[PDB]
Amino acid sequence: GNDYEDRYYRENMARYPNQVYYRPVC
Numbered sequence: 446g447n448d449y450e451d452r453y454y455r456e457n458m459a460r461y462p463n464q465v466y467y468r469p470v471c
Contacts, residue, residue: 448454457467464470 446452446454450456460467461470
């Protein structure tokens, strides 16, 4: 959070465990 965001830091940076990329899952 002290970096930049915290509530928005997790957005596209901490996604689903099956997401090899951002959108790419398959």
